[PDB]
Amino acid sequence: EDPPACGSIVPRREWRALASECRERLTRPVRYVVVSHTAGSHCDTPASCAQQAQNVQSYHVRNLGWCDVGYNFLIGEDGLVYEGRGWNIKGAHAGPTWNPISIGISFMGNYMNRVPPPRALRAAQNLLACGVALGALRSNYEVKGHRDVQPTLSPGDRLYEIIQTWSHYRA
Amino acid sequence: EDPPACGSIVPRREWRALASECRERLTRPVRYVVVSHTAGSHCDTPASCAQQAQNVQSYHVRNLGWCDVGYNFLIGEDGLVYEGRGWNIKGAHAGPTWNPISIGISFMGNYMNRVPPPRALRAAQNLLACGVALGALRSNYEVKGHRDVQPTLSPGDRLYEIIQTWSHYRA
Amino acid sequence: EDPPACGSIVPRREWRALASECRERLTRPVRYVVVSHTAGSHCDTPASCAQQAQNVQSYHVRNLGWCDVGYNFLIGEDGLVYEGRGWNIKGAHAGPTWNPISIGISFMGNYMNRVPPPRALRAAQNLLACGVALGALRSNYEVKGHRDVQPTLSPGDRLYEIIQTWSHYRA
Amino acid sequence: EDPPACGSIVPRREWRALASECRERLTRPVRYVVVSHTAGSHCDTPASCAQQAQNVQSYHVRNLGWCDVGYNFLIGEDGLVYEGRGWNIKGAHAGPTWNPISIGISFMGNYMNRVPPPRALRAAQNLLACGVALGALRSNYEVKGHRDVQPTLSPGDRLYEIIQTWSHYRA
């Protein structure tokens, strides 16, 4: 019986997202969070970041044939969180073994030789507390890098060393 | 230091604020929240809004002689919340009767002939919600507008209307 | 690396384990084994022991919110070995420094005031020879007692008394 | 302000503690407090209790190779508190999840079949009031029993029964 507010998320409709066709659910509460980067263009304003959110979803649906944008949430350098598949629907961001048991949040950019700005990290972190607040994440959830669960550079050398310093990181 | 979370607030230092010099403390937990608009330029990128927070504080300090920017928090149209005097230092935004007992948050822009983006409204309500969990804001806080509290056109015709729809609104 | 069907380990399904959620892996051959007891009530039947193994998992999983019962294997007084996290997943039985480089077998019961029956000791030693045959443990593995790596009364005095005699033990 | 005013703690040198080598720090204000018990023998006089603080330390530094005794503070039945790693240094009493986010305080003795004497329970409650005064603990900190976060009988049945009673207990 826990309903009270948490965080601000730019909702699906606001970034003009094509409707989702996904239906398979995740079991509450989820234990894992997998952090990735989109290795795409970065954006630093709400307008440019909505455009970008759109280009990622578009590529995932129109080209890779997924039911919706791959991630559960995306993060913009504008410091805003963008609604992806949400807390309840299984994403498609870290392979068949990890997708069924995790929330995948992806920073929008290529963080190999750049770090995302403090407002991004802050937003990403708020998001997770919120997940815990809503009961979508276990209070003792675990943060993982994309590269820890799949062979990739994601989330980029720099954002990778950053996230290892997070309270909930577990190699 | 401090683990980065509650309602993604842009910290003082991040928006290049001059150091605060106020020492009057506020009585946690506070009953009222007064909404005002700054009546200055509006911005909508994190870059433009930090510069605007900087400009508002500068007018209050260099010109008006105040110990720091008047409001406890500033909400930019970029959808981020800006740390003014915070949850602990008594503000200066609604006169002697109200400053000691209420928390003031201000929307950056003139909202007489305009409304702020949904994201600004989200950052706002979500800032108050994050207040509660601090002890800053009592669970059942009442929200007054600047008009309901002092003879001002603030927070603007159109923004004022919106405010009255809000949940914890006791005029 | 022959094909010996060593050890009669009771499968998770047989004692009715709740599905594990652990994904962390151990690198074989593991160089260490840490012996603890559950400090709890004991069982001398394949029927109570299956139940006790359930109880223990329930504690670690429902109370402590863990990904599975902590030990890799549990030894009952009934003379059988219950599959915990097995030879390949990293247990949670002796801390951050030893978990990654060891396998934790734990005797069901409290052995401060009793030695565990010869069949339990036999289950344990055969368990270990078995691990060596599968190549999961180094032929020259070292056996430490729980209290030798973490502050605890575990594995119990009498049993600590016994494991110190064991060929593979090492201060 | 009502000037600090808290605790009569027997410092490290007074009990002769080996120089600490631990460097990793806690960030204040700390939110959780974990109550354990030494599980070993008790002590009811200053030199008697100062003798144990030294033993317990020796066991953790000499036998397990740690940088300093495990707990932040120990409670003798002489009714004194003994300095452990204190308020600022990360302890080693409840695992990698809770160590970096709590203060571990352990009663010297085994409270399975007995309770600490009023003096001891006062020394502990007073210790915590103090931590809050010094701003080393959140004013709304939570007290957890060792067994609530690690598998162990610590702090013993009867003491566990006692802390469940405490104002800041939460499981």
Ligand SMILES: O=C(O)C1=C[C@@H](O)[C@@H](O)[C@H](O)C1
């Ligand atoms: O100051 C704090 O540590 C916090 C307290 C809670 O309200 C949380 O909801 C917040 O994210 C962090």
